[PDB]
Amino acid sequence: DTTNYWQDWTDGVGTVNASNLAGGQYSVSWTNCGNFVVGKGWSTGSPSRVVNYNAGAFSPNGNGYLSLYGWTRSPLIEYYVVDDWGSYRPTGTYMGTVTSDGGTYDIYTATRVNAPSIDGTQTFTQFWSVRQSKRSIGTNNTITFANHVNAWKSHGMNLGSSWAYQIIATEGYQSSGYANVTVW
């Protein structure tokens, strides 16, 4: 189940240089970005996928995230399993916790109103698992996504029936930084 998909999306604000390197590896350098989502993974997500990564570097100067990230449709859901962040730890409405792969994660919901999405301007829902402390960087890290899917289900956070991409994403917001990550 090695990676099959490369994502290099930016809103075109500031400079985001993303490199599609061999296999599951990518890098990104950014200066004064708006928003971007870069990473590697799978063009069709699975609720049972076991994802592995090693972030050789993850050094946001300000707001960036390193997450398992993807979308469903029917309904439209943007989801995150956040292992590392910079200056800002993302939150929403608290639902409970899930303990997986050595971490305890807070579970949040949020609504995004007429906001940017995979289908342009849409009102959609976010499902979050946010680690309570930053995960180690430069280590081989597993995200057992079924644990998060099943924890989310227990709070009525059911994913949509149509799966879009599923990646280990570096995301920045009004920040600068560097990352270098290998996914498998």
Automatic annotation (TrEMBL):
| Designated name of the protein | Endo-1,4-beta-xylanase
User: One MF term from GO for this chain?
Assistant: endo-1,4-beta-xylanase activity
Identify the PROSITE patterns for this entry: GH11_1 (PS00776), GH11_2 (PS00777), GH11_3 (PS51761)
Keyword terms: Carbohydrate metabolism, Glycosidase, Hydrolase, Polysaccharide degradation, Signal, Xylan degradation
What family is reported? Belongs to the glycosyl hydrolase 11 (cellulase G) family.
Q: Can you tell me which residues form the catalytic site?
A: 78, 171
Matching entries from InterPro entries are given as: ConA-like_dom_sf, GH11/12, GH11_AS_1, GH11_AS_2, GH11_dom, Glyco_hydro_11
The chain positions of domain GH11 read 1-184
What is the catalytic activity of this protein? Endohydrolysis of (1->4)-beta-D-xylosidic linkages in xylans
One Pfam family name is Glyco_hydro_11
Task: Tell me a GO biological process for this protein.
Answer: xylan catabolic process
Pathway participation = Glycan degradation; xylan degradation
Identify the EC number(s). Answer: 3.2.1.8
